[PDB]
A paper describes a structure:
[name] is a JmjC domain-containing protein, present in both the nucleus and the cytoplasm. Building from an extensive peptide-based screen for potential [name] substrates, our results provide evidence that [name] is a JmjC-hydroxylase, catalysing the stereoselective C-3 hydroxylation of arginyl residues in sequences from proteins involved in chromatin stability (RCCD1) and translation ([name]). Consistent with previous reports, [name] residues 174–416 fold into mixed helical and β-strand topology comprising seven α-helices, 13 β-strands and 3 310 helices. Like most 2OG-oxygenases, the [name] active site contains a metal centre, which is octahedrally coordinated by an HXD..H motif (H321 and D323/βII, H400/βVII), the 2OG oxalyl group and a water molecule, which is likely replaced by a dioxygen during catalysis.
Numbering used by the authors: 181 to 416
């Protein structure tokens, strides 16, 4: 159990050799801290630019829950019901291609140059928004591409487990959830999942202007500590 390392604007070669090729997480500083988003994206700005648009919203504590569901509403409705007014349930505008929907917002972000070290096309990079209140939780899971998760507003608590530790994370048996752990990271049932207790991990609090590199297939768990807006870039 240790902290994810933080590096200020490392060279492309240093990132490639020490992090990308070996598949090791790192937080990059001084890279996204000057996105216009970092100063422009307030709730008021998001309402002005996106408020009338329809977005998918996940409702419930964790997508692994039984009562969890997905609905559609405007961004203004999402803010009113799940952020500003004392909300009744946790809602999360998660994993949504908001920048394709609202191209004006693309002007406020940039793809990190480190993504050019991959073997894929820039036109195939997928950019997703993650916008929600304090307390959203994305259960421990792994993704099939590299990721840069950029924090714009608020902070997130992140726990990372290597693919080498997959046995101790008890992936779901069904094919559709095989990329998700059965374990609740922050309150694990150690009578049912004893191997989880000894599995090593990295953790961090990701703050505005920071980029977390999540290597392909690295298991990650994310809880928002404040009202939060993150932007993920999936690339190969
Ligand atoms: O930010 C979150 O809640 C979860 N993020 C991701 O799983 C991701 O960027 O791939
Ligand atoms: Mn993910």
């Amino acid at each position: 159990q240790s902290t994810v390392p933080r590096l200020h604007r490392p060279s492309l070669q240093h990132f490639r050799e020490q992090f990308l090729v070996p598949g090791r997480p790192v937080i990059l500083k001084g890279v996204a801290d000057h996105w216009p988003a970092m100063q422009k994206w307030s709730l008021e700005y998001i309402q002005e630019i996106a408020g009338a648009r329809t977005v998918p919203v996940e409702v419930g504590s964790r997508y692994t829950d039984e009562e969890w569901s997905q609905t559609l509403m405007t961004v203004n409705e999402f803010i009113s019901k799940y952020i500003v007014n004392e909300p009744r349930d946790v809602g999360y505008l998660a994993q949504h291609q908001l920048f394709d929907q609202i191209p004006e917002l693309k002007q406020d972000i940039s793809i990190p140059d480190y993504a050019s070290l991959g073997d894929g096309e820039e036109e195939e990079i997928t950019i997703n928004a993650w916008f929600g209140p304090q307390g959203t939780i994305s259960p421990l899971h792994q993704d099939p591409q590299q990721n840069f998760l950029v924090q714009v507003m608020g902070r997130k608590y992140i726990r990372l487990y290597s693919p080498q530790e997959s046995g101790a994370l008890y992936p779901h048996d069904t094919h559709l959830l095989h990329n998700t752990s059965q374990v609740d990271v922050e309150n694990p049932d150690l009578e049912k999942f004893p191997k989880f207790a000894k599995a090593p991990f990295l953790s961090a609090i990701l703050s505005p202007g920071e980029i977390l590199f999540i290597p392909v297939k690295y298991w990650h768990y994310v809880r928002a500590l404040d009202l939060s807006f993150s932007v993920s870039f999936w690339w190969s």
